[PDB]
Amino acid sequence: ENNGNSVKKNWSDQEMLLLLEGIEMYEDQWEKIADHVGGHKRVEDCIEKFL
Protein backbone atom coordinates (compact mmCIF):
# COMPACT_ATOMS: atom_id res chain seq x y z
CA GLU A 1 0.00 0.00 0.00
CA ASN A 2 0.90 3.68 -0.12
CA ASN A 3 -1.55 5.23 2.36
CA GLY A 4 -0.63 6.55 5.78
CA ASN A 5 -1.47 3.85 8.32
CA SER A 6 -3.05 4.15 11.76
CA VAL A 7 -1.73 5.52 15.06
CA LYS A 8 1.91 4.57 15.63
CA LYS A 9 3.32 1.48 17.37
CA ASN A 10 1.02 -0.82 15.45
CA TRP A 11 3.62 -2.21 13.00
CA SER A 12 1.59 -3.86 10.26
CA ASP A 13 3.20 -6.74 8.35
CA GLN A 14 3.97 -4.47 5.39
CA GLU A 15 6.16 -2.26 7.57
CA MET A 16 7.86 -5.26 9.20
CA LEU A 17 8.58 -6.71 5.76
CA LEU A 18 10.00 -3.43 4.43
CA LEU A 19 12.12 -3.02 7.57
CA LEU A 20 13.64 -6.47 7.10
CA GLU A 21 14.15 -5.71 3.38
CA GLY A 22 16.05 -2.58 4.39
CA ILE A 23 18.22 -4.47 6.89
CA GLU A 24 19.07 -6.99 4.17
CA MET A 25 19.85 -4.10 1.80
CA TYR A 26 22.03 -1.71 3.73
CA GLU A 27 23.33 -3.49 6.92
CA ASP A 28 23.71 0.00 8.52
CA GLN A 29 22.50 3.51 7.70
CA TRP A 30 19.26 3.74 9.65
CA GLU A 31 18.17 6.86 7.76
CA LYS A 32 18.20 4.69 4.62
CA ILE A 33 16.23 2.10 6.59
CA ALA A 34 13.64 4.52 7.99
CA ASP A 35 12.86 6.07 4.62
CA HIS A 36 12.52 2.63 3.03
CA VAL A 37 9.95 1.82 5.71
CA GLY A 38 8.08 4.87 4.42
CA GLY A 39 9.61 7.91 6.07
CA HIS A 40 6.85 8.28 8.68
CA LYS A 41 8.94 6.49 11.33
CA ARG A 42 12.05 7.74 13.09
CA VAL A 43 15.46 6.08 13.33
CA GLU A 44 15.04 5.92 17.13
CA ASP A 45 11.89 3.80 16.68
CA CYS A 46 13.10 1.46 13.94
CA ILE A 47 16.03 0.53 16.17
CA GLU A 48 13.68 0.14 19.14
CA LYS A 49 11.55 -2.23 17.06
CA PHE A 50 14.35 -4.31 15.52
CA LEU A 51 15.72 -4.97 19.01
Place this chain on the structure above:
Amino acid sequence: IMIDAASSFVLPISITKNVDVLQRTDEILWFRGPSVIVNERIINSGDPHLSLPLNRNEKESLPGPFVLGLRPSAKFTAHRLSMLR
Protein backbone atom coordinates in the same frame (compact mmCIF):
# COMPACT_ATOMS: atom_id res chain seq x y z
CA ILE B 1 20.99 -9.33 -18.83
CA MET B 2 19.94 -5.74 -18.23
CA ILE B 3 17.02 -4.42 -16.20
CA ASP B 4 16.87 -0.67 -16.85
CA ALA B 5 15.60 -0.68 -20.45
CA ALA B 6 12.81 1.78 -21.22
CA SER B 7 10.19 -0.63 -22.69
CA SER B 8 7.55 2.07 -23.17
CA PHE B 9 7.34 4.64 -25.92
CA VAL B 10 5.25 7.67 -26.88
CA LEU B 11 4.66 8.96 -30.44
CA PRO B 12 4.82 12.77 -30.84
CA ILE B 13 1.53 13.28 -32.74
CA SER B 14 -1.35 14.12 -30.41
CA ILE B 15 -4.01 11.69 -31.65
CA THR B 16 -6.02 12.15 -28.42
CA LYS B 17 -9.45 12.41 -30.03
CA ASN B 18 -10.98 8.91 -29.92
CA VAL B 19 -8.67 7.60 -27.20
CA ASP B 20 -10.28 7.68 -23.77
CA VAL B 21 -10.51 3.88 -23.46
CA LEU B 22 -6.79 3.00 -23.66
CA GLN B 23 -4.08 3.57 -21.02
CA ARG B 24 -2.99 7.21 -21.11
CA THR B 25 0.10 8.71 -19.40
CA ASP B 26 -1.30 11.95 -17.97
CA GLU B 27 -0.68 10.91 -24.69
CA ILE B 28 -0.82 7.16 -25.38
CA LEU B 29 1.62 4.64 -23.91
CA TRP B 30 3.07 2.22 -26.47
CA PHE B 31 4.87 -0.77 -24.96
CA ARG B 32 7.51 -3.09 -26.43
CA GLY B 33 5.40 -6.25 -26.13
CA PRO B 34 1.72 -7.21 -25.95
CA SER B 35 -0.44 -7.72 -22.89
CA VAL B 36 -1.18 -11.00 -21.10
CA ILE B 37 -4.81 -12.01 -20.51
CA VAL B 38 -5.24 -14.26 -17.47
CA ASN B 39 -8.65 -15.93 -17.13
CA GLU B 40 -8.79 -16.61 -13.38
CA ARG B 41 -6.15 -15.81 -10.82
CA ILE B 42 -6.80 -18.53 -8.21
CA ILE B 43 -6.17 -22.16 -9.17
CA ASN B 44 -8.54 -24.81 -7.80
CA SER B 45 -6.01 -27.37 -6.63
CA GLY B 46 -8.16 -30.46 -6.05
CA ASP B 47 -11.00 -31.26 -8.51
CA PRO B 48 -10.17 -34.46 -10.52
CA HIS B 49 -10.50 -32.46 -13.72
CA LEU B 50 -7.10 -31.16 -12.57
CA SER B 51 -5.77 -33.50 -9.86
CA LEU B 52 -6.05 -36.68 -12.03
CA PRO B 53 -6.33 -39.58 -9.52
CA LEU B 54 -4.85 -42.95 -10.48
CA ASN B 55 -8.12 -44.91 -10.28
CA ARG B 56 -10.79 -45.80 -12.86
CA ASN B 57 -11.52 -41.28 -23.76
CA GLU B 58 -14.27 -39.13 -22.22
CA LYS B 59 -15.21 -35.50 -22.80
CA GLU B 60 -17.09 -33.01 -20.62
CA SER B 61 -18.29 -29.51 -21.55
CA LEU B 62 -18.18 -27.76 -18.21
CA PRO B 63 -20.09 -24.48 -17.77
CA GLY B 64 -17.61 -21.63 -18.11
CA PRO B 65 -14.21 -21.24 -16.47
CA PHE B 66 -15.92 -20.40 -13.16
CA VAL B 67 -15.74 -24.02 -11.96
CA LEU B 68 -11.95 -23.64 -11.63
CA GLY B 69 -11.89 -20.44 -9.61
CA LEU B 70 -13.23 -20.74 -6.02
CA ARG B 71 -16.33 -18.72 -6.17
CA PRO B 72 -18.36 -18.26 -2.97
CA SER B 73 -21.98 -19.32 -2.83
CA ALA B 74 -24.70 -16.70 -2.69
CA LYS B 75 -26.27 -17.76 0.62
CA PHE B 76 -23.10 -16.74 2.47
CA THR B 77 -23.04 -13.40 0.66
CA ALA B 78 -26.65 -12.73 1.63
CA HIS B 79 -25.84 -13.81 5.20
CA ARG B 80 -22.93 -11.37 5.28
CA LEU B 81 -25.01 -8.55 3.79
CA SER B 82 -27.58 -9.28 6.51
CA MET B 83 -24.75 -9.04 9.04
CA LEU B 84 -23.82 -5.69 7.43
CA ARG B 85 -26.89 -3.96 8.89
Place this chain on the structure above:
Amino acid sequence: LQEQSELMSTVMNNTPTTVAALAAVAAASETNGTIPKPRSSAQLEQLLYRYRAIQNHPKENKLEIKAIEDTFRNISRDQDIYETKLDTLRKSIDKGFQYDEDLLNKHLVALQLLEKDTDVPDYFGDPDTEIRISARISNRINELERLPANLGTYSLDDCLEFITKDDLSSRMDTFKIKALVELKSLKLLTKQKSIRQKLINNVASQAHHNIPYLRDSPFTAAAQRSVQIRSKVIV
Protein backbone atom coordinates in the same frame (compact mmCIF):
# COMPACT_ATOMS: atom_id res chain seq x y z
CA LEU C 1 16.79 -48.87 -0.69
CA GLN C 2 13.28 -47.34 -0.43
CA GLU C 3 11.18 -49.79 -2.46
CA GLN C 4 8.11 -47.80 -1.34
CA SER C 5 9.75 -44.88 -3.16
CA GLU C 6 10.95 -47.02 -6.07
CA LEU C 7 7.32 -47.90 -6.84
CA MET C 8 6.50 -44.18 -6.74
CA SER C 9 9.40 -43.38 -9.08
CA THR C 10 8.31 -46.12 -11.49
CA VAL C 11 4.74 -44.76 -11.36
CA MET C 12 5.70 -41.10 -11.88
CA ASN C 13 8.11 -42.04 -14.69
CA ASN C 14 5.09 -43.72 -16.40
CA THR C 15 7.18 -46.84 -17.22
CA PRO C 16 6.48 -49.57 -14.66
CA THR C 17 5.80 -52.57 -16.91
CA THR C 18 9.14 -52.15 -18.70
CA VAL C 19 11.20 -52.90 -15.56
CA ALA C 20 8.79 -54.29 -12.89
CA ALA C 21 11.61 -54.14 -10.27
CA LEU C 22 13.03 -57.57 -11.35
CA ALA C 23 11.15 -59.56 -8.72
CA ALA C 24 13.53 -62.31 -7.65
CA VAL C 25 15.23 -63.11 -4.35
CA ALA C 26 18.26 -60.99 -5.27
CA ALA C 27 16.39 -57.74 -6.03
CA ALA C 28 12.86 -57.76 -4.55
CA SER C 29 14.15 -59.00 -1.17
CA GLU C 30 17.25 -56.79 -0.99
CA THR C 31 15.15 -53.62 -0.70
CA ASN C 32 12.69 -55.09 1.81
CA GLY C 33 15.33 -55.21 4.56
CA THR C 34 6.75 -60.06 3.03
CA ILE C 35 6.50 -56.32 2.28
CA PRO C 36 6.85 -53.79 5.14
CA LYS C 37 3.11 -52.83 5.55
CA PRO C 38 2.86 -49.29 4.02
CA ARG C 39 2.51 -46.30 6.30
CA SER C 40 0.50 -43.61 4.48
CA SER C 41 -3.25 -43.16 4.13
CA ALA C 42 -3.44 -43.99 0.44
CA GLN C 43 -0.20 -42.60 -1.05
CA LEU C 44 1.62 -45.93 -0.57
CA GLU C 45 -1.55 -48.02 -1.11
CA GLN C 46 -2.73 -46.74 -4.51
CA LEU C 47 0.80 -47.52 -5.71
CA LEU C 48 0.29 -51.13 -4.61
CA TYR C 49 -3.11 -51.10 -6.36
CA ARG C 50 -1.56 -49.91 -9.63
CA TYR C 51 1.39 -52.29 -9.17
CA ARG C 52 -0.92 -55.31 -8.91
CA ALA C 53 -3.05 -53.96 -11.78
CA ILE C 54 0.05 -53.75 -14.02
CA GLN C 55 1.40 -57.12 -12.89
CA ASN C 56 -1.80 -58.91 -13.95
CA HIS C 57 -0.36 -59.19 -17.47
CA PRO C 58 2.89 -61.22 -16.76
CA LYS C 59 1.46 -63.06 -13.68
CA GLU C 60 4.38 -65.52 -13.36
CA ASN C 61 7.62 -63.53 -13.68
CA LYS C 62 6.85 -61.73 -10.40
CA LEU C 63 6.82 -64.05 -7.38
CA GLU C 64 6.20 -61.20 -4.92
CA ILE C 65 2.46 -60.96 -5.76
CA LYS C 66 1.54 -63.37 -2.95
CA ALA C 67 2.99 -61.29 -0.09
CA ILE C 68 1.28 -58.19 -1.48
CA GLU C 69 -2.02 -60.10 -1.57
CA ASP C 70 -1.37 -61.28 2.01
CA THR C 71 -1.06 -57.64 3.01
CA PHE C 72 -4.32 -56.93 1.16
CA ARG C 73 -5.86 -59.69 3.29
CA ASN C 74 -4.35 -58.05 6.38
CA ILE C 75 -5.80 -54.66 5.39
CA SER C 76 -9.25 -56.16 4.74
CA ARG C 77 -9.13 -58.06 8.05
CA ASP C 78 -8.06 -54.98 10.03
CA GLN C 79 -10.78 -52.97 8.29
CA ASP C 80 -13.46 -55.52 9.17
CA ILE C 81 -12.19 -55.63 12.78
CA TYR C 82 -12.36 -51.83 12.96
CA GLU C 83 -15.87 -51.77 11.50
CA THR C 84 -17.07 -54.31 14.08
CA LYS C 85 -15.31 -52.35 16.83
CA LEU C 86 -16.91 -49.11 15.63
CA ASP C 87 -20.29 -50.84 15.65
CA THR C 88 -19.68 -51.93 19.24
CA LEU C 89 -18.10 -48.61 20.28
CA ARG C 90 -21.21 -46.67 19.29
CA LYS C 91 -23.21 -49.14 21.41
CA SER C 92 -20.93 -48.85 24.48
CA ILE C 93 -21.70 -45.16 25.08
CA ASP C 94 -23.28 -44.08 28.37
CA LYS C 95 -26.58 -42.23 28.15
CA GLY C 96 -25.39 -39.27 30.24
CA PHE C 97 -21.97 -37.74 30.90
CA GLN C 98 -22.36 -33.98 30.17
CA TYR C 99 -18.79 -33.33 28.99
CA ASP C 100 -17.40 -30.09 30.40
CA GLU C 101 -16.79 -27.12 28.10
CA ASP C 102 -13.69 -25.47 29.58
CA LEU C 103 -11.72 -28.71 29.35
CA LEU C 104 -12.90 -29.40 25.80
CA ASN C 105 -11.37 -25.97 25.05
CA LYS C 106 -8.04 -27.07 26.49
CA HIS C 107 -8.04 -30.45 24.73
CA LEU C 108 -8.80 -28.85 21.35
CA VAL C 109 -6.15 -26.13 21.73
CA ALA C 110 -3.62 -28.66 23.05
CA LEU C 111 -4.23 -31.14 20.21
CA GLN C 112 -3.98 -28.34 17.63
CA LEU C 113 -0.68 -27.11 19.07
CA LEU C 114 0.65 -30.68 19.29
CA GLU C 115 -0.16 -31.30 15.62
CA LYS C 116 2.09 -28.70 14.04
CA ASP C 117 5.13 -29.02 16.38
CA THR C 118 4.95 -26.03 18.71
CA ASP C 119 5.45 -25.81 22.46
CA VAL C 120 2.40 -26.24 24.68
CA PRO C 121 2.25 -24.56 28.11
CA ASP C 122 1.01 -26.93 30.78
CA TYR C 123 -2.08 -25.53 32.61
CA PHE C 124 -3.16 -29.06 33.60
CA GLY C 125 26.36 -21.64 27.73
CA ASP C 126 26.48 -25.47 27.70
CA PRO C 127 27.14 -26.14 23.98
CA ASP C 128 25.38 -29.49 24.20
CA THR C 129 22.06 -27.64 24.52
CA GLU C 130 23.20 -24.85 22.19
CA ILE C 131 23.31 -27.06 19.09
CA ARG C 132 19.90 -28.54 19.98
CA ILE C 133 18.52 -25.00 19.57
CA SER C 134 20.50 -24.17 16.42
CA ALA C 135 19.22 -27.37 14.79
CA ARG C 136 15.57 -26.44 15.29
CA ILE C 137 16.06 -23.14 13.45
CA SER C 138 17.51 -24.87 10.39
CA ASN C 139 14.37 -27.04 10.47
CA ARG C 140 12.14 -23.97 10.25
CA ILE C 141 14.28 -22.30 7.58
CA ASN C 142 14.36 -25.40 5.38
CA GLU C 143 10.63 -25.86 5.93
CA LEU C 144 9.71 -22.27 5.02
CA GLU C 145 12.02 -22.32 1.99
CA ARG C 146 9.99 -25.11 0.36
CA LEU C 147 6.71 -23.24 0.24
CA PRO C 148 5.55 -22.30 -3.27
CA ALA C 149 6.05 -18.66 -4.20
CA ASN C 150 2.56 -18.48 -5.75
CA LEU C 151 0.94 -18.73 -2.33
CA GLY C 152 -2.17 -16.69 -1.73
CA THR C 153 -5.12 -16.40 0.58
CA TYR C 154 -8.85 -16.46 0.15
CA SER C 155 -10.45 -14.89 3.19
CA LEU C 156 -14.16 -15.04 3.99
CA ASP C 157 -14.37 -11.25 3.52
CA ASP C 158 -13.86 -11.03 -0.25
CA CYS C 159 -17.59 -11.63 -0.74
CA LEU C 160 -18.23 -7.99 0.23
CA GLU C 161 -16.05 -6.69 -2.63
CA PHE C 162 -17.68 -8.38 -5.68
CA ILE C 163 -14.52 -9.45 -7.50
CA THR C 164 -15.10 -9.85 -11.25
CA LYS C 165 -13.24 -12.01 -13.78
CA ASP C 166 -10.24 -9.65 -13.40
CA ASP C 167 -10.46 -7.30 -10.41
CA LEU C 168 -7.40 -7.92 -8.10
CA SER C 169 -8.80 -8.19 -4.55
CA SER C 170 -6.94 -6.37 -1.78
CA ARG C 171 -6.49 -9.17 0.78
CA MET C 172 -4.73 -11.72 -1.43
CA ASP C 173 -1.34 -11.40 0.28
CA THR C 174 -2.02 -11.79 4.00
CA PHE C 175 -0.09 -15.08 4.17
CA LYS C 176 2.87 -14.53 1.83
CA ILE C 177 4.02 -11.45 3.74
CA LYS C 178 3.70 -13.44 6.98
CA ALA C 179 5.68 -16.28 5.38
CA LEU C 180 8.52 -13.87 4.61
CA VAL C 181 8.61 -11.96 7.91
CA GLU C 182 9.47 -15.28 9.57
CA LEU C 183 11.90 -16.42 6.85
CA LYS C 184 13.84 -13.15 6.89
CA SER C 185 13.62 -12.65 10.65
CA LEU C 186 15.23 -16.08 11.07
CA LYS C 187 18.12 -14.94 8.88
CA LEU C 188 18.68 -11.56 10.58
CA LEU C 189 19.30 -13.22 13.94
CA THR C 190 23.08 -12.74 14.05
CA LYS C 191 22.58 -9.10 13.18
CA GLN C 192 20.34 -8.30 16.13
CA LYS C 193 22.76 -10.28 18.29
CA SER C 194 25.55 -7.97 17.11
CA ILE C 195 23.39 -4.91 17.79
CA ARG C 196 22.46 -6.18 21.26
CA GLN C 197 26.16 -6.68 22.04
CA LYS C 198 26.89 -3.07 21.06
CA LEU C 199 23.93 -1.96 23.19
CA ILE C 200 24.76 -3.90 26.36
CA ASN C 201 28.54 -3.35 26.14
CA ASN C 202 27.89 0.41 26.07
CA VAL C 203 25.11 0.63 28.68
CA ALA C 204 26.66 -1.78 31.16
CA SER C 205 30.15 -0.53 30.30
CA GLN C 206 29.51 2.69 32.21
CA ALA C 207 27.28 1.37 35.03
CA HIS C 208 28.54 3.91 37.61
CA HIS C 209 27.66 7.27 36.06
CA ASN C 210 24.02 6.70 35.03
CA ILE C 211 22.63 4.38 37.71
CA PRO C 212 22.04 6.55 40.81
CA TYR C 213 22.22 3.95 43.59
CA LEU C 214 25.64 2.73 42.39
CA ARG C 215 27.43 6.08 42.03
CA ASP C 216 26.27 7.05 45.53
CA SER C 217 27.71 4.04 47.37
CA PRO C 218 30.85 4.55 49.51
CA PHE C 219 33.18 2.18 47.70
CA THR C 220 32.39 3.18 44.10
CA ALA C 221 32.78 6.88 44.89
CA ALA C 222 36.01 6.11 46.76
CA ALA C 223 37.40 4.10 43.84
CA GLN C 224 36.49 6.75 41.26
CA ARG C 225 37.98 9.39 43.54
CA SER C 226 41.14 7.36 44.12
CA VAL C 227 41.83 6.65 40.44
CA GLN C 228 42.08 10.42 39.82
CA ILE C 229 44.98 11.04 42.22
CA ARG C 230 47.73 12.97 40.45
CA SER C 231 51.24 11.76 41.25
CA LYS C 232 53.32 13.56 43.84
CA VAL C 233 55.92 16.08 42.68
CA ILE C 234 59.26 15.45 44.37
CA VAL C 235 60.69 18.90 45.26
Place this chain on the structure above:
Amino acid sequence: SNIPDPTLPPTEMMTRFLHPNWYALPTTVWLKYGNYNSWAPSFNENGTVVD
Protein backbone atom coordinates in the same frame (compact mmCIF):
# COMPACT_ATOMS: atom_id res chain seq x y z
CA SER D 1 23.99 -9.16 1.92
CA ASN D 2 27.00 -10.08 4.06
CA ILE D 3 25.20 -11.45 7.12
CA PRO D 4 25.94 -15.07 8.11
CA ASP D 5 23.64 -18.05 8.46
CA PRO D 6 22.27 -18.49 12.01
CA THR D 7 23.78 -22.00 12.05
CA LEU D 8 27.38 -20.84 12.57
CA PRO D 9 29.39 -21.64 15.75
CA PRO D 10 29.56 -18.07 17.20
CA THR D 11 26.18 -17.92 18.97
CA GLU D 12 27.58 -16.91 22.35
CA MET D 13 26.61 -13.22 22.95
CA MET D 14 28.29 -13.15 26.41
CA THR D 15 31.91 -14.27 26.44
CA ARG D 16 34.06 -11.34 27.60
CA PHE D 17 31.42 -9.28 29.37
CA LEU D 18 32.96 -8.19 32.72
CA HIS D 19 30.40 -5.87 34.31
CA PRO D 20 31.98 -3.10 36.45
CA ASN D 21 30.48 -4.61 39.56
CA TRP D 22 33.05 -7.35 38.91
CA TYR D 23 36.12 -5.11 38.59
CA ALA D 24 39.10 -5.35 40.91
CA LEU D 25 39.15 -2.51 43.38
CA PRO D 26 42.43 -1.03 44.68
CA THR D 27 43.16 -2.13 48.26
CA THR D 28 46.13 -2.20 50.61
CA VAL D 29 49.47 -3.70 49.62
CA TRP D 30 51.19 -5.66 52.37
CA LEU D 31 54.97 -5.44 52.09
CA LYS D 32 57.70 -7.81 53.29
CA TYR D 33 61.11 -6.41 54.20
CA GLY D 34 63.07 -9.35 55.57
CA ASN D 35 63.35 -11.97 58.26
CA TYR D 36 64.37 -9.69 61.14
CA ASN D 37 62.68 -6.36 60.36
CA SER D 38 59.80 -6.02 62.84
CA TRP D 39 59.72 -2.24 63.30
CA ALA D 40 59.39 -1.20 59.64
CA PRO D 41 56.21 0.27 58.10
CA SER D 42 54.60 -3.02 57.20
CA PHE D 43 52.13 -2.07 54.46
CA ASN D 44 51.23 0.67 51.97
CA GLU D 45 47.91 2.37 51.20
CA ASN D 46 48.14 5.06 48.51
CA GLY D 47 44.70 5.10 46.90
CA THR D 48 42.85 2.28 48.58
CA VAL D 49 39.11 1.84 49.00
CA VAL D 50 39.09 -0.07 52.30
CA ASP D 51 41.44 -0.06 55.28
